[PDB]
Amino acid sequence: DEAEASKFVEEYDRTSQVVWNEYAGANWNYNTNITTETSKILLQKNMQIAQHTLKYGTQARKFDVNQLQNTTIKRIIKKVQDLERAALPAQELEEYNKILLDMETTYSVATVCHPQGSCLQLEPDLTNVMATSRKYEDLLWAWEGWRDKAGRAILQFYPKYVELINQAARLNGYVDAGDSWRSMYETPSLEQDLERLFQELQPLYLNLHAYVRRALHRHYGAQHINLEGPIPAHLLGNMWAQTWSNIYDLVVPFPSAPSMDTTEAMLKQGWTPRRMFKEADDFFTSLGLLPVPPEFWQKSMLEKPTDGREVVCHASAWDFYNGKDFRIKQCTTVNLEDLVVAHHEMGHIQYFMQYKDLPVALREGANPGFHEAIGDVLALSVSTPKHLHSLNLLSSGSDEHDINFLMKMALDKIAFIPFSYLVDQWRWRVFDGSITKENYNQEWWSLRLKYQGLCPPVPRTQGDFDPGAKFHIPSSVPYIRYFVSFIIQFQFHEALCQAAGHTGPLHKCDIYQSKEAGQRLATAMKLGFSRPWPEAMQLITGQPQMSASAMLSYFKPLLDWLRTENELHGEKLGWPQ
Template sequence: MTRTLAATLLLSTALCLPAAAAAKPSAREAKAFIAEVEENYEQLWEEAARIAWLKATYINFDSNWLEAKINAELTEIAVEYANRAKDFDDTRVSDDVRRKLNILKQSITLPAPTRDGAASELAAITSRLDSAYSTGKIDFEDEVVPQNQTEILMRQLRDPAKLEEVWTKWRGNSVQMKQDYVDMVEIANAGAKELGYDDLGQMWRSNYDMDPDAFAEETDRLWGQVEPLYTNLQCHVKYRLNEEYGDEVVPLDQPIRADLLGNMWAQSWGSIYDLVAPPTGDSESINLDEILVAADYTPLKITQTAESFFTSLGFDPLPDTFYERSQITKPEGREVVCHASAWNLDNVDDIRIKMCTEVNADDFRTMHHELGHNFYQRAYNKQPMLFRGDPNDGFHEAIGDMITLSITPEYLQQIGLVDEVPSADGDLALLMNEALEGVAFLPFGLLVDKWRWQVFSGELTPETYNDGWWALREQYQGIRPPNERPADAFDPGAKYHIPGNTPYMRYFLARVLQYQFYKAACDQIGWEGPLHRCSFYGAEEVGEKFNAMLEKGNSQPWQDSLELFTGTREMDASALVEYYRPLMEWLEAENEGRQCGW
């Protein structure tokens, strides 16, 4: 996750101000307008970003107040600019100016309508939603457990009753969010309509250099490429969980209980690897959790190791201020947002990460991912203000994800974490471990925004929010809740990105682009072995071409940037399918005769 210009300014809530009636404006006026916008945002950027950082790393009444105030101010400006940009729709302007005008119109996450007080009301709602999630706690075994520790419990517990307890209690926190969420949808939808969209979902889908309906079809096409792989993985996991827990807990003719998959949201299943692992032959599988602890890794050392991956590609080291100002571990004595994110506070080089890092494999990979955001942010910092971002919001997420694929046994040997690389007969284990993260996530990455699109369009009403959520989770993931959900449940709010109002389709696109970028990098170094064995650590030729794409920021359509690095203009999941081909063949053999599907 990253906080960029789009996230802090253009993606803030905003008050729609009616555009003044005027004669058709000229190209010169359009250019002057863009210059005014970029100059103003240059001045506003740092104040807004530092307040957002303060709120995320020191949650209290005052930081909430400051964030709500600056958001209300900024949002009035953001959609005033969006409405003024509409005035130039029929004006002939240069390609760069047209792209910047479109960015102003399309990049607002939560617009508010014209009525007095709407922007302040919306800003207050979003601040409350964010804080309600971040400060949520549960009582478990006579202890008060904060949000980040509930995630650890879901990874470590194996008793179905205790898993159900933690899972259910965490969702109890989100009940309080529902009315705020309902009000937020009503206000933001009204704002989207004033900007000329049918609803907020259409507005979100318009930001992909293609028709909004065509974009929805594109996501379905990509899902179709990977669905057979996911279906086989889900079937295998269901049967192994049945062997572990029995028919009463895991009946083979039903979707899998969501609390049994080692993750609070059943979006990644790596924590149950030991229950579903394939045979490793004579090769011992790598337990990175144990290796990191044995090697005396600390959160700081994890951060430095991730940085070294990028410098091995030829990128300059992070500035000293990164280590001085980042939140690498959870501070004592104050409430913070532990959800990992990367920040650029001055839009130049005050780049930071915010994590509550633990010494484990998950956070080792997450740190590589988050630094991908930071190096991307610095790469495009010489672009004009409105082009400092990614051309497709899947790009930012894919950059770090691409690096995590290069965390192969060969890479771990190169940095001294393992002495010997396991033989090829352990590759199925490696691929299963990766698939429990990269493949298991795919349908969840798709359905979160599909749910929101249905909410924004009115297809789902507040009374059917929860039923619609679980219908999509069963349809795409083949999972179900562990118990009957109460009438007032708001289970979507148990996932940060819903109360945090962060569009989620970027994560689905990132999974596809991750493998597409990765294969392109491996092709560039002339890799001839199985794709999953490739590591481009130390390949400066990859870094040079990679940086050339990153430097473009949002200055051109994503199709142009994709072509610059991969040679193709279409997102394509075939690299992902190729990566997991050996595992897919094994899964198909294992699943023969089983009752797959749901």
């Protein structure tokens, strides 16, 4: 009966709101005040939501969805039939919950110490080392130490986590957890589609990689850089070498056309975390998009707290499933990297607000990549010289400043393409069983080399587990969303820029105040997960595929410049060595 399924989805919707609100609450209080008490209440809430998932999930499995007419309801009920971890038996469930908590805690409390010296945490201390040191040995100490302390200490947990997460996935009808993750895109040709997109970014990536390697050779010396081989992983200004913008000063295309450092100018002008967020909020409302509620400003945590309350640091955006309470938790330090992350996070908030009227089973992005992309789109505009000058963070013309800006953007956007691509290639193969605990690490390095062209500055040994040294691995947060985000963000930027009348090169576009550009994003974001994503894509861009066109078009003047430059020096692209 259509009426029985309709009634059920109404009850699911009412009851979910309450239980998910409760559990978000508990999880929030834990996250912004790690204690015994907050931790106890959390795992108690863990069991409550698992029991609701089981109750609702079991009833939903009694519907023949074949027989269901109405498509919204068919779709809602098919989502409810996935129990996720609630499929596991009592014991396995308790055990998996404990495993995930133990992995996150290990990661977040890991420190690296000098003998009779300081102990350094990851944020800000080690990341500052990785960003600002130009000493080979000091970068290696930080790079190696972080792996020794965080990555190895994850190893004890990983095999059992794989086993439990695969087990929940098979219990929900998937072959393994990777298949369950891929299913979120509802795109049977996903792996081939992402492959094609990755192959289209190779010219730009290879060219950027060779010019960077040359510049490293100049700074770090002929004996430590092979001009035909992989780059050492510790030299790119970032712990995971996933974004290279911290070595912009070693690689500037035109040193004669100098510019202010945003970070230095933000400090210089007394920017606070709160101002960074107010600036993001102003960009959204300039587009006709929704302002964050007054409650957001009272309840969010926008910097490390200062009352000796312990908190998890990783920037994250939070929906509380009541349609009115939305929050960010970020240990925001005052620089451009975090100003971008602020926009990222406000992007997530904006999406939650846009889809707040749908049934909760549909309160998701068109696909995880859309959810990741929203804030980054706005931040493309924020990063332009034009926009930075208007925030009073840049002095203000030339081709030289142009190629210089493109290079800055490239070190963040292009460099991240192979990294964002490889993370889940690795995990898809762990979950399907083709990588075992005997070769986790070797297999990670094989992908680091194949996709990024990097090598480990130090030989890895058995017992190393470098993947565990990246947050998303112990946290069990899927990563391909980030590769998707980075492709489709340039597509959305191109469409919104056209929406706004911009003409000339795409990288000069700034959509600030464009109501036409707001309208494109709003109608798509309003759809939540109610329709296949190509429909949201078609609303924004006028067509329904993922395409690297827009990213290539953005970077085209830089590609030309890199080609002439690498050719003049005879660079050999790639790293056969």
